[PDB]
Design an enzyme around this catalytic site. Sequence first.
Site, PDB file in Angstrom:
ATOM      1  N   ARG A 222      -8.696   4.034   0.560  1.00 40.07           N
ATOM      2  CA  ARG A 222      -8.845   4.053  -0.889  1.00 40.07           C
ATOM      3  C   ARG A 222     -10.300   4.179  -1.326  1.00 40.07           C
ATOM      4  O   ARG A 222     -10.575   4.493  -2.481  1.00 40.07           O
ATOM      5  CB  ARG A 222      -8.250   2.772  -1.467  1.00 40.07           C
TER       6      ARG A 222
ATOM      7  N   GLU B 239      -1.428  -3.311 -12.426  1.00 40.53           N
ATOM      8  CA  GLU B 239      -1.901  -2.817 -11.138  1.00 40.53           C
ATOM      9  C   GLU B 239      -1.441  -1.392 -10.912  1.00 40.53           C
ATOM     10  O   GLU B 239      -0.299  -1.029 -11.262  1.00 40.53           O
ATOM     11  CB  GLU B 239      -1.378  -3.701 -10.020  1.00 40.53           C
TER      12      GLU B 239
ATOM     13  N   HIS C 158       6.594  -3.945  -2.803  1.00 39.50           N
ATOM     14  CA  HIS C 158       6.026  -3.955  -1.458  1.00 39.50           C
ATOM     15  C   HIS C 158       6.694  -4.968  -0.557  1.00 39.50           C
ATOM     16  O   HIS C 158       7.433  -5.800  -1.077  1.00 39.50           O
ATOM     17  CB  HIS C 158       4.524  -4.166  -1.508  1.00 39.50           C
TER      18      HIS C 158
HETATM   19 ZN   LIG Z   1       1.723  -0.437  -4.407  1.00 39.28          ZN
END
Ligand SMILES: [Zn+2]
Lengths: 82, 130
Positions: free
Chosen positions: B4, B99, B130
């Site tokens: 990222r 988020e 997740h």
């Molecule tokens: Zn995610």
Amino acid sequence: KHSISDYTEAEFLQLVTTICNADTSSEEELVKLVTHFEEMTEHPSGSDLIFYPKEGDDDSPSGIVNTVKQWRAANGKSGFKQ
Amino acid sequence: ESKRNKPGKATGKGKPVGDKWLDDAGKDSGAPIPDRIADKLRDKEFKSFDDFRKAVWEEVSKDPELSKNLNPSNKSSVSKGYSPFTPKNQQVGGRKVYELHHDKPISQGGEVYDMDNIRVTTPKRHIDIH
Ligand SMILES: [Zn+2]
């Protein structure tokens, strides 16, 4: 600053104002302030008082302080210093 | 120790959204990146996904159709590129703000800066995914 009775109203208004204006150096700092706010007020709505006012509620810094002040008064809690 | 954090250019179309845009964030795969935001960020280079995240919220602050659905406090946040706070009931402990989520995970080859692979989620919904 361990409880809301450690704050004068005017001091508390400064905290709320800082949060409302995102007047911090980082998001992390702001989130910590919001958490502290929720711990001080003990209000069921938590950060919703700042970000998700109920219809008719004044979400300006002074409006939020009043809501907190009135809620604590009405619900058996100690108030601001002085 | 991350992917990222590698620079890249934003791509992708996003999708039309309405006033319930952020309501969608706590459901399903989360809310899409608005087409309007994608138009503004397309082809811009970002040094990390976090820099991309900042740009999204700055564009939200600048967009009357999106910002009109945030209160004065949340407006102040997005003006600084901060992620806006979710409703209390969508927060999870110290995770209190929207988020950004990768629908196809980056760890699985998903694209980092393709806005068609990005969703806005609440902490509660993101953790559940997740
Ligand atoms: Zn995610």
